[PDB]
Design a protein around this ligand. Structure first.
Ligand code: MG
Ligand code: MG
Ligand code: MG
Ligand code: MG
Ligand code: MG
Ligand code: MG
Ligand code: MG
Ligand code: MG
Ligand code: MG
Ligand code: MG
Ligand code: MG
Ligand code: MG
Ligand code: MG
Ligand code: MG
Ligand code: MG
Ligand code: MG
Ligand code: MG
Ligand code: MG
Ligand code: MG
Ligand code: MG
Ligand code: MG
Ligand code: MG
Ligand code: MG
Ligand code: MG
Ligand code: MG
Ligand code: MG
Ligand code: MG
Ligand code: MG
Ligand code: MG
Ligand code: MG
Ligand code: MG
Ligand code: MG
Ligand code: MG
Ligand code: MG
Ligand code: MG
Ligand code: MG
Ligand code: MG
Ligand code: MG
Ligand code: MG
Ligand code: MG
Ligand code: MG
Ligand code: MG
Ligand code: MG
Ligand code: MG
Ligand code: MG
Ligand code: MG
Ligand code: MG
Ligand code: MG
Ligand code: MG
Ligand code: MG
Ligand code: MG
Ligand code: MG
Ligand code: MG
Ligand code: ZN
Lengths: 69, 50, 114, 151, 61, 91
RNA sequence: AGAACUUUGAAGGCCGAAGUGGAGAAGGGUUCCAUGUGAACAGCAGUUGAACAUGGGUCAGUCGGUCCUGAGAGAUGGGCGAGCGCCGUUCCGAAGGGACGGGCGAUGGCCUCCGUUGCCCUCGGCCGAUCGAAAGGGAGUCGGGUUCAGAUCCCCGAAUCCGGAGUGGCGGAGAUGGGCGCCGCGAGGCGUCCAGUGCGGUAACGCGACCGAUCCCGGAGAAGCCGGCGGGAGCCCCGGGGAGAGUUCUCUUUUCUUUGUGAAGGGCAGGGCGCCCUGGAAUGGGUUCGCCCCGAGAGAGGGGCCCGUGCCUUGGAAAGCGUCGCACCUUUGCUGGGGUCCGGUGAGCUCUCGCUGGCCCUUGAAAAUCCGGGGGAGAGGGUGUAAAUCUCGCGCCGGGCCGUACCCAUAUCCGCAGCAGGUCUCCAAGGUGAACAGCCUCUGGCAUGUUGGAACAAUGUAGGUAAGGGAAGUCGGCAAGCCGGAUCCGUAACUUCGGGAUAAGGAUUGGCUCUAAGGGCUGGCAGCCGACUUAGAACUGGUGCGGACCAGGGGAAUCCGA
RNA sequence: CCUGGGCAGGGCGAAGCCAGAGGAAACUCUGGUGGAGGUCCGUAGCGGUCCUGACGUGCAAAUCGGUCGUCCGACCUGGG
């Protein structure tokens, strides 16, 4: 897989053609937005819940987001 | 052997097919004199030799 | 304390199968086969025991996957020769051409008199 | 299976753009990087090959040819040489003394490298045990056991 | 573990419970290695701490 | 710490192979393993690789020489006579 | 129906990691699994079986064959031979049918442009067809789960290798600057010309890519054996914490099981360098267990490269595993906690990596695939518009055929058989002990090897003692028997001076308390942390101490063979 | 011939190296380090001396139990 650290490229990858699956994993002080593609699985981890609650709605609709747990 | 070739496996297939008992519906056939199969090969007693 | 087994049909500790034991997420040890280590290329007529630097040391068939930037050096004779022998050949060539010029002008100055 | 070392010499092809690699018998006194000259009018030095018709008498040479073009057949063992003792301008012939002491007359066109073959004195060391003789003959051929006929 | 504690204290280590040579129980080579490494790094430390110059360091080495 | 009286490198053989054979092989056992001064580099690194092959450890300029010594007393006079014949009457 | 041989539970034992364990190659070919009967097979019996009858069971681009040559076998050319044919493998052969480019001619797709076909020119050593390894070379899959029988094959999840792109899939490089004049306050815009086949560091070298045709050069593939030393991992050991389990007549914060991060990609420790720059030393230097290295540039300072199997992160906790539970006994899933807790030591065992040395009249394999470099035949838009090419980041499509069960064995192989025989490999713990010796246990298997009950006569087969003598028996010290390990002294004749030699001959060996010595780390001589080795002494046991096991009788001479 | 696999632990201490002592010099001596050998005890492996042991219509058309020789090699072994 590929870890994403910046704020501008993960959304560009999630708005691609092969972004069929997007999952959200909640952990202790950790939120992971794993976008599955044809070749890789891009993972963006964040430790702030405020930056996650306002970013979860920014995902493109119709991509079948699955909230884990 | 654990791994063999297609020719040897096909040759073993016919031996597996032939190692079968006599059907019980030919005993009542007219003119039948066969009472038991005399070609039953045992895997331990008689080795078919590759 | 836990004895494991091979994973392939090879049963002889030959050079083709070099197993290192590793721990799986399932809490168990198992062999993993390792590719034979690749040696970095050595220069031509240069330093004998010293391999070339900056060139990836991996098996030959792997070089199809590597990029050209990770298989050579920017200078002339990058992935073929070492640094010392390059400047050695440069100096040697320049000096022998200067010596040819010297012997030519010597033949000329001898012809101008004889 | 041979005591004489083999020197790899690279020449430049005079007709094609390619380097030719040859395996000569390394005469004693040559090192890696030394330029070796092969021809008729080559300077008389150790390692250089040149026809026997041009070298003076008493020249210690080795790895010569019986006939012109035989390509180095005589005096090929380690530490052996042949001594040129005579010359004939007309009806070109040359008398040489071989390591066996035999004086043979050969042609004056065949060549010979100058110098003694490296590895001399190879027989001064006793084998000192059967293991070294076995390891020696294992590379040569299966002829070592040599059971006596009267046994 | 109790027997190991006894061995550490010195029990069951007399001449009557030795079945191997002294060089087998404790290799002279590894004892020499330890004794040499200790003194060599001690001398390195003393030379680095300006306690001894290099001319004395070499003769001591 | 003198450990042996007369026997030297051939002390590894022990009591076998006789006495005169060991005495004769010792003379060349001293030479074939001793390092020689490189005539090109200048260091005492001329360990022999094989029979008649002597390579240096500094420049690795390999030379073909004697089987047990760096040079043989026969090849020395052969080279001397070759040089003499070259200088006499212009080769 | 029938029980000593089947099944379950318990107790007592063996194999004890060089196994009576878990897997394989050759070989066997259905022997593997489920159901059913019990006349035949199983050397007694049988409800049992590897027997019988029925029905199932082997899923691959990334496991191996298929590819490559090695020793070697082999057809044609040619030779021989009455002849089936044989020798011969580069020899006595017109033994390259393919391609780069250019030209002529024809054809097809949206005839703009390209793809083909026929001919001409130029160029092009095969090391000669072909076969030859299921251990040699050979690109690329790992984690969890699933069955009565399959696992790197099946499912989930996460990757990767090799091929295809003709109307060339999208991005990024090559791609975009300079000079002159004009307009505009300025930012900027316009007309002409020119550059532009990438950059940075002094270097060793680095990056997101970096035009390349015949040809040439080089490397990897591609290396012997054995000593040492260091790093990494697994296993072993100790101390603390948590879950579960055992004992508790007495003691024991005690004893036992477990306490996780795969391929792939990034970063950081660690290891190696015969790799670069400043400067040049002797009062020689810094260094290893050992060597080795230095004016052909040491010490010191600063940098670079390769492996990074170790650590963290995406994968990754939602799966997996012990624990206490809510539905449920052909609907059985789901709960929540603790697991990714803190560490340490080591001549410890195994695997791997690296450095160095030794051994020689022994130099320790080729080929296929692939890469780099030198050369500069050619191609490309020509400029504030954009091409020749991309070994860069993505996206699409495919990967055919063959084998995959089981035994691999004192019961699935061979020996006429369920035969103390033979048959090639991997993993291998704890205690004693120098040790993979011998002995005792744990994980894992087993019924004592084709039967049991009762008694302990002679003879027999293995095992151990015997008072006094100690080879007096016998052809013969045959067998049996003595010493047997370690520490400390002492070691003859002879000799090739290396040996004899553990010569011979002597003293000690237990248990529990002690003493002394043998180290590392933190700070400008002090404080803490942990391995077992040695030496000495005291006390004590009915002189017993290698307390079992382990295990050299010796000397004096002759003959022969180093 | 080609291609692969394997050989626990201890003893003796060859070359080379360092240090010290003695000597007017030549040089000698001593204590370490070093780890060579077709070296020694000995396991796995490889063979089979003795008991002329047991069996001798046997487990076996050549086996078994003690006792044995060698175990880094002139070593053992698989496949071709
Ligand atoms: Mg009738
Ligand atoms: Mg038959
Ligand atoms: Mg293979
Ligand atoms: Mg004979
Ligand atoms: Mg006879
Ligand atoms: Mg020692
Ligand atoms: Mg039972
Ligand atoms: Mg027991
Ligand atoms: Mg083992
Ligand atoms: Mg076994
Ligand atoms: Mg039944
Ligand atoms: Mg029966
Ligand atoms: Mg069955
Ligand atoms: Mg059946
Ligand atoms: Mg798959
Ligand atoms: Mg394959
Ligand atoms: Mg033929
Ligand atoms: Mg013919
Ligand atoms: Mg083939
Ligand atoms: Mg799985
Ligand atoms: Mg199975
Ligand atoms: Mg591709
Ligand atoms: Mg190691
Ligand atoms: Mg990783
Ligand atoms: Mg360690
Ligand atoms: Mg299987
Ligand atoms: Mg058997
Ligand atoms: Mg057996
Ligand atoms: Mg143990
Ligand atoms: Mg112990
Ligand atoms: Mg029984
Ligand atoms: Mg049986
Ligand atoms: Mg008596
Ligand atoms: Mg008595
Ligand atoms: Mg007596
Ligand atoms: Mg008497
Ligand atoms: Mg008598
Ligand atoms: Mg006896
Ligand atoms: Mg006497
Ligand atoms: Mg004696
Ligand atoms: Mg104390
Ligand atoms: Mg004899
Ligand atoms: Mg030996
Ligand atoms: Mg002896
Ligand atoms: Mg034995
Ligand atoms: Mg026997
Ligand atoms: Mg026998
Ligand atoms: Mg006998
Ligand atoms: Mg008998
Ligand atoms: Mg009898
Ligand atoms: Mg023995
Ligand atoms: Mg003996
Ligand atoms: Mg021995
Ligand atoms: Zn040199």
């Amino acid at each position: 897989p590929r870890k994403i650290e910046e704020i501008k490229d993960f959304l560009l990858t999630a708005r691609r053609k092969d972004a069929k699956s997007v999952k959200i994993k909640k952990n202790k002080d950790n939120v992971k937005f794993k976008v599955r593609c044809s070749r890789y699985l891009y993972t963006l981890v964040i430790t702030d819940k405020e930056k996650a609650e306002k970013l979860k709605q920014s995902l493109p609709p119709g991509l079948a987001v699955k909230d884990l747990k | 052997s654990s791994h063999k070739t297609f020719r040897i496996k096909r040759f073993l297939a016919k031996k597996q097919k032939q190692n079968r008992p006599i059907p019980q519906w030919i005993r009542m056939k007219t003119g039948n004199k066969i009472r038991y199969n005399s070609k039953r090969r045992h895997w331990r007693r008689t080795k078919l030799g590759l | 304390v836990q004895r494991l087994t091979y994973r392939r049909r090879l049963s002889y500790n030959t050079a083709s199968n070099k197993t290192r034991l590793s721990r799986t997420p399932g809490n168990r040890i198992v062999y993993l086969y390792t590719k034979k280590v690749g040696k970095a290329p050595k220069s031509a007529c240069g330093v004998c025991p010293g391999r070339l630097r900056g060139v990836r040391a991996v098996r030959p068939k792997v070089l199809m996957r590597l990029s050209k930037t990770q298989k050579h050096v920017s200078r002339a004779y990058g992935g073929s020769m070492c640094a010392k022998c390059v400047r050695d050949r440069i100096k040697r060539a320049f000096l022998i051409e200067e010596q040819k010029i010297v012997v030519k002008v010597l033949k000329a100055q001898a012809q101008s008199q004889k | 299976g041979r005591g004489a070392p083999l020197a790899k010499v690279v020449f430049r092809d005079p007709y094609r753009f390619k380097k030719r690699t040859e395996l000569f018998i390394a005469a004693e006194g040559i090192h890696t990087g030394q330029f070796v000259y092969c021809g008729k009018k080559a300077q008389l030095n150790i390692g250089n090959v040149l026809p026997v018709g041009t070298m003076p008498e008493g020249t210690i040479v080795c790895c010569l040819e019986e006939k012109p073009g035989d390509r180095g057949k005589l005096a090929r063992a380690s530490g052996n040489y042949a001594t040129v003792i005579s010359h004939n301008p007309e009806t070109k012939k040359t008398r040489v003394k071989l390591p066996s002491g035999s004086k043979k007359v050969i042609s004056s066109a065949n060549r010979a490298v100058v110098g003694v073959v490296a590895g001399g004195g190879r027989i001064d060391k006793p084998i000192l045990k059967a293991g070294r003789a076995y390891h020696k003959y294992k590379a040569k051929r299966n002829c070592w056991p040599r059971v006596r006929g009267v046994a | 573990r109790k027997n190991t504690l006894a061995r550490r204290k010195g029990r069951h280590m007399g001449i009557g419970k030795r079945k191997g040579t002294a060089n087998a129980r404790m290799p002279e080579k590894v004892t020499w290695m330890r004794r040499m490494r200790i003194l060599r790094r001690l001398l390195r430390r003393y030379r680095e701490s300006k306690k001894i110059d290099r001319h004395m360091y070499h003769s001591l080495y | 710490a003198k450990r042996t009286k007369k026997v030297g490198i051939v002390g590894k053989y022990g009591t076998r192979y006789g006495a005169s054979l060991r005495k004769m092989v010792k003379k060349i056992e001293i030479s074939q393993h001793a390092k020689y001064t490189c005539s090109f580099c200048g260091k005492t690194k001329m360990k022999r690789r094989a029979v008649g092959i002597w390579h240096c450890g500094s420049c690795m300029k390999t030379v073909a020489g004697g089987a047990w010594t760096y040079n043989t007393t026969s090849a020395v006079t052969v080279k001397s006579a070759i040089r003499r014949l070259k200088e006499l009457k212009d080769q």
